[PDB]
């Protein structure tokens, strides 16, 4: 067993320490966040920080890193979409994180395709098999490191046919959702089992 | 494609809605949180909400659901361990979530084994292959649904030999870390690829 002390971790070069600490949370979700400004200019960003907050009411949280437009659009319009990345699109999803021209939509820049549904004024990713609209409820600034904790209410959900079981469970491996580890590693899930209420 | 509206989701029975909304974040990390009270009584809980907050300083966040002892111990002593669940121990990890006697340690109650390291006064899970000590920095109460957002600084990390690559990356599949989806589904990761800075 190897031991990395607090001092040893601080000694590491910035990028090495980044890969290392970002690996420590365990698996993370891979989601595309669809937004637009008030003039209808769209944006799309991959994030790995979507976190469940509750089912009643249905609340989802995410942490925004210390592009600017995704957070700015959310703050200005209060609307966004969350779209599962899947194995067919994880390369294009990853590409959204590149730095683009100020007015360059990551939808336009990549092979991903926007989609508007149910009068919701933020674009969905057409290629995503599980996605939902979200309305901003609260944002909390974390001064400890400059992150933003964005809290929103789930509105509408769209999911491939046959994916949602009668008890509400969705098999993420069956719809080919991908997971992330570290800053840049993508994985599919291989189901072990569902375990009953302990 | 199926569409579940806000109204449809609210119509679902509590447990069905729970499975459904908890599936929507995508994959989640599976971590055991080791704690003890001021008298040395230990506790252990599985959580699926550990989230990366930053690498400099190294901060990890977690959301505690709306057992009491894990949060109480953290608040009273300011110390806890975060331990990756792996394929060999996910059944026992799941069992920690059962309701136990007031003074019954989940270490004692399950096949998992406590371990103290480097003078840190919170127990580690011996069987975990990636684990770290954490010191409480901040806790924020979320009144929107009664959750607690617990923020701590990573102190010491312990990891199986050969797991940490020279660039800091840790292959979670190689150390057999497990992921969670929904409320009760466990998975291993099957690596697709690491992608370069876009
Ligand atoms: Ca050593
Ligand atoms: Ca496109
Ligand atoms: Ca329909
Ligand atoms: Ca035991």
From TrEMBL, chains A, B:
Keywords: Calcium, Flavoprotein, FMN, Metal-binding
Highest taxon listed in the record's lineage: Bacteria
Keyword Calcium: yes
Cofactor: FMN
Annotated binding of Ca(2+), by residue: 107, 110, 112
Domain spans labelled Flavin reductase like: 32-164
Coiled-coil features, chain-numbered ranges: none
SUPFAM superfamilies assigned to the protein according to its UniProt record, in alphabetical order: FMN-binding split barrel
GO molecular function, one term: FMN binding
PANTHER family: FLAVIN REDUCTASE LIKE DOMAIN-CONTAINING PROTEIN (PTHR33798:SF5), FLAVOPROTEIN OXYGENASE (PTHR33798)
Family: Belongs to the flavoredoxin family.
Record-given protein name: Flavin reductase like domain-containing protein
Species name: Shewanella frigidimarina (strain NCIMB 400)
